[PDB]
């Protein structure tokens, strides 16, 4: 009884065998701004004073960033936020031992939503060091020369930032004969990897708050364990 | 269009952290069907609509049984409307009397990062990207002392 058709993830038919009809939907990884700065170090003629990775960034996100500013951090690093919508009036009941009530749903349109054409995205990744916390502990720009201060970042790969969603689903109708005669229709994804176009980093800038007129250095390490 | 420079003369006292919101006139307009729902939103509001149908495919013959003999597409009476506040500003700019001050900063910078870093616990980040802030002091609410204006 199993009959198979090819359908698009929105239910549109594909007419199998036709060339250039199946295009995969593409993700972004959750929190692209954290994974982009995979390894950040600060150098003053070598001798790296501060060095951290993306794991320190997601740890200080999980711990230090408050819930009021959670939507701000999710907008900065390019995370989808839940847009809340409403359905409409409903029947309901009131059991006490009748009333009109609206149903609230949540949906997302952001980067992590699988899309056929993901729009160009704005990453604003905050840089965290020991002198970025207190304005009284901000290091002077005149105590040491500005030439020797350098920042080195290891950007992640394109395969580490963008994943693919299956843009084709095998739709299986199945007529189970009998009384009752069930018709189970299921969908199994058809996931064949394609070639994602190369991501072009545009408007790469660093914003520095150069205002006009003891310390807490965070020491991080990464270890791999198999015991 | 494409350049909207507005000058004011009422502001004479020193200015601390400043919230600015650019609400479309259509949000509070009478002609808006969603005026009441979208009045408190400083961005361009659109509506994404779920129309969740109840699909059911039924076969009658018990012989052909490959393409269903009938289907059904019962939609709900009230479709689900999500209000999206798309951003209304691309590059915000606040120019002072003699210095450049704020020059072509993106709206995501002034709407997300500045509430995130400046303000402390007392100032939260708004969900609507149209609402934004321009900062003038290092300590907006962290202490009761002028740290810049």
């Amino acid at each position: 009884g199993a009959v198979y058709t090819l359908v698009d993830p929105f239910g549109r038919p594909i007419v199998p065998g036709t060339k250039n009809a199946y295009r995969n939907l593409v993700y972004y990884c959750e929190y692209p701004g954290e994974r982009l700065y995979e390894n950040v170090r600060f150098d003053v003629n070598g001798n790296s004073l501060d060095e951290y990775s993306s794991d320190v960034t997601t740890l200080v996100r999980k711990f230090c960033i408050p819930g009021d500013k959670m939507t701000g951090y999710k907008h900065l690093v390019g995370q989808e936020v839940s847009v809340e919508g409403t359905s409409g009036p409903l029947l309901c009941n009131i059991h006490d031992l009748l009333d009109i009530r609206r149903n609230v749903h949540y949906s997302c349109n952001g980067p992590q939503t699988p899309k056929y054409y993901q729009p160009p995205l704005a990453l604003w990744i905050k840089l965290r060091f020991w002198f970025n916390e207190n304005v009284n502990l901000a290091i002077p720009s005149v105590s040491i020369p500005f030439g020797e201060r350098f920042i080195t970042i290891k950007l992640a790969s394109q395969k580490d930032l963008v994943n693919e969603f299956p843009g084709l689903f095998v739709r299986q109708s199945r007529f189970i004969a009998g009384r009752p005669s069930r018709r189970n229709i299921r969908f199994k994804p058809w996931f064949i990897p394609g070639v994602i176009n190369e991501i072009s980093l545009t408007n790469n800038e660093l914003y520095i708050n150069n205002l006009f007129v003891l310390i807490r250095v965070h020491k991080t390490q990464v270890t791999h364990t198999n015991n | 269009n494409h350049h909207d420079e507005k000058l004011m003369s009422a502001l004479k006292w020193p200015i601390e952290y400043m919230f600015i919101g650019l609400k479309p006139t259509w949000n509070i307009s009478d002609q808006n069907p969603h005026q009441h729902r979208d009045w408190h939103k400083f961005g361009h509001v659109v509506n994404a609509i779920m129309q969740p149908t109840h699909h059911a495919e039924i076969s009658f013959q018990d012989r052909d049984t490959a393409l269903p003999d009938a289907c059904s597409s019962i939609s709900d009476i009230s479709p689900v409307t999500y209000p999206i506040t798309l951003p209304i500003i691309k590059n915000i700019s606040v120019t002072a009397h003699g210095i450049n001050l704020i020059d072509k900063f993106p709206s995501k910078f002034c709407s997300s990062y500045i509430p995130f870093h400046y303000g402390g616990n007392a100032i939260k980040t708004p969900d609507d990207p149209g609402a934004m802030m321009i900062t003038f002091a290092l300590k907006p609410r962290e202490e009761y002392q002028p740290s810049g204006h």
Partner: antibody, heavy 124, light 109 residues
Framework: EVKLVESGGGLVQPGGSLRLSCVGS????????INWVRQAPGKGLEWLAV????????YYADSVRGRLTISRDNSQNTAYLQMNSLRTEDTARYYC?????????????????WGPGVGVVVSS | QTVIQEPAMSVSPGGTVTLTCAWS?????????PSWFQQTPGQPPRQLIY???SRPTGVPRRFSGKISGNKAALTITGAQAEDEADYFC??????????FGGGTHLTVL
């Protein structure tokens, strides 16, 4: 290993009856449908009759509706076809075929294994 | 209402041949489910293709099925000397169930 050998056909006068018996071996005959298909010597195939898995729910072809009555006995793994009346058109090779459900369920979509064929030669 | 095949083609060994079957009146929709059968003389017919593009186990990969224009097509690419047989097309009409063609005798030279 799996076979659908059949017998019981021969030269009969027109307007007569024949009893075609098809036996099956080693393929759990009670669980698979069996059909009867006619092949004329030069006019191609022609599907005659269906009996279902249990034995009931018999549906025939339009040209031989009522003329041919099919039956099934799962105890001895046999399918019977009764040709109650025969014109001169019915001389052909008859095959008992195993056919389960792929798209069209009861008439059969995948005629997997065919019998060797029994030749009915009606002649006055 | 009947299905018609052409009487014969001839194909060279290692060549590609395309047998066609079609309704007498109307189009051959994919809901008519063409099924192609091969019958070597002295042998019972064998299921080659069912549901217009699918092959049961044991059928060689060289047979392909399609629906072109308003007819159904069996394409044999690199046909061998074992393909010289009678080829039958059958369409599933809703009322008359499977209706089989006259038969195309493929000649492998």
């Amino acid at each position: 290993e799996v076979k659908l050998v059949e017998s019981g056909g021969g030269l009969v006068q027109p307007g007569g009856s024949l009893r075609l018996s098809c036996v099956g071996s080693g393929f759990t005959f009670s669980s698979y449908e069996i059909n009867w298909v006619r092949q004329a010597p030069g006019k191609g195939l022609e599907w005659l009759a269906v009996v279902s898995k249990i034995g009931d729910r018999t549906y025939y072809a339009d040209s031989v509706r009522g003329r041919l009555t099919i039956s099934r006995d799962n105890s001895q793994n046999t399918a019977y076809l009764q040709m109650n009346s025969l014109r001169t058109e019915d001389t052909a090779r008859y095959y008992c075929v195993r056919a389960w459900c792929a798209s069209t369920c009861l008439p059969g979509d995948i005629m997997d294994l065919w019998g060797p064929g029994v030749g009915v030669v009606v002649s006055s | 209402q009947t299905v018609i095949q052409e009487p014969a083609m001839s194909v060279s060994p290692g060549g590609t041949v395309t047998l066609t079957c079609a309704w007498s009146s109307g189009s051959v929709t994919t809901s008519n489910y063409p099924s192609w059968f091969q019958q070597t003389p002295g042998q019972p017919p064998r299921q080659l293709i069912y549901n217009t593009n699918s092959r049961p186990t044991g059928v060689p990969r060289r047979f392909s099925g399609k629906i072109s224009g308003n007819k159904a097509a069996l394409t044999i690419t690199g046909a061998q000397a074992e393909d010289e047989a009678d080829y039958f097309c059958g369409l599933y009409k809703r009322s008359a169930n499977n209706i089989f063609g006259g038969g195309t005798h493929l000649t492998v030279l």
